[PDB]
Amino acid sequence: LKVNQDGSQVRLRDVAKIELGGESYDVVAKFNGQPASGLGIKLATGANAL
Amino acid sequence: GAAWGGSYVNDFIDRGRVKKVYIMSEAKYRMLPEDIGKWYVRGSDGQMVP
Amino acid sequence: VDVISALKAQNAQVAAGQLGGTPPVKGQQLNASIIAQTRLTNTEEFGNIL
Amino acid sequence: DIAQVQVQNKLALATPLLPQEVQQQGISVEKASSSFLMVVGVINTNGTMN
Known part of the structure; x- marks a missing residue:
């Protein structure tokens, strides 16, 4: 990110907390109280449901 | 071009339009x-140059 | 060119997020969207551009 | 299908009037539904994955 005048260098570790996380934290699903994820499938117009 | 023909710079909100x-x-x-x-x-x- | 630069910089949209947005701190109780719209509407605001 | 085509034509006519910001994002014309046909949930019984 920057090199200080004394030669010291600052990186994303020094100013942030890099971490693998979700794109968005808005939606949280639970199945019978257990942490879970799912797909909400919508039928296309004029298609057989079965 | 801007002086003689004109230029569309950006947009603005007037009465919600x-x-x-x-x-x-x-x-x-x-x-x-x-x-x-x-x-x-x-x-x-x-x-400034003529 | 300077007029164009100033006009482009003046009007814009800011995705300012929310107070208490996800992921929230434990115990948070207020979630409000942040609105920072520095937009210019009438003629005088445009004339007042630095 | 013809309805979608006509809607796309009208949307193309109306697009230039829209803000440049929303033009960059890209507008979507899709056949729509209202209710989920099926919800398929995924859980991890080992309680290892959040």
């Missing part, structure tokens, strides 16, 4: 070929 923002010379200064000399362009030295 997006409207364009144009800039152009006031008509007095873009009517005759002699009006070319009235326009100055800044140089790297900071001196």
Whole structure:
């Protein structure tokens, strides 16, 4: 990110907390109280449901 | 181009409607070929150039 | 060119997020969207551009 | 299908009036539904994955 005048260098570790996380934290699903994820499938117009 | 033909810079909100923002010379200064000399362009030295 | 630059910079949209947005701190209780709209509507605001 | 085509034509006619910001994002024309046909949830019985 920057090199200080004394030669010291600052990186994303020094100013942030890099971490693998979700794109968005808005939606949280639970199945019978257990942490879970799912797909909400919508039928296309004029298609057989079965 | 901006002085003689005009330029659509960006938009603005008026009474909840997006409207364009144009800039152009006031008509007095873009009517005759002699009006070319009235326009100055800044140089790297900071001196306006006819 | 300077007029164009100023006009482009003046009007914009800011995705300012929310107070208490996800992921929230434990115990958070207020979630409000942040609105920072430095938009110019009438003529005088445009004339007042630095 | 013809309805979608006509809607796309009208949307193309109306797009330039829209703000440039929303034009960059890209507008979507899709056949729509209202209710989920099926919800398929995924859980991890080992309680290892959040």
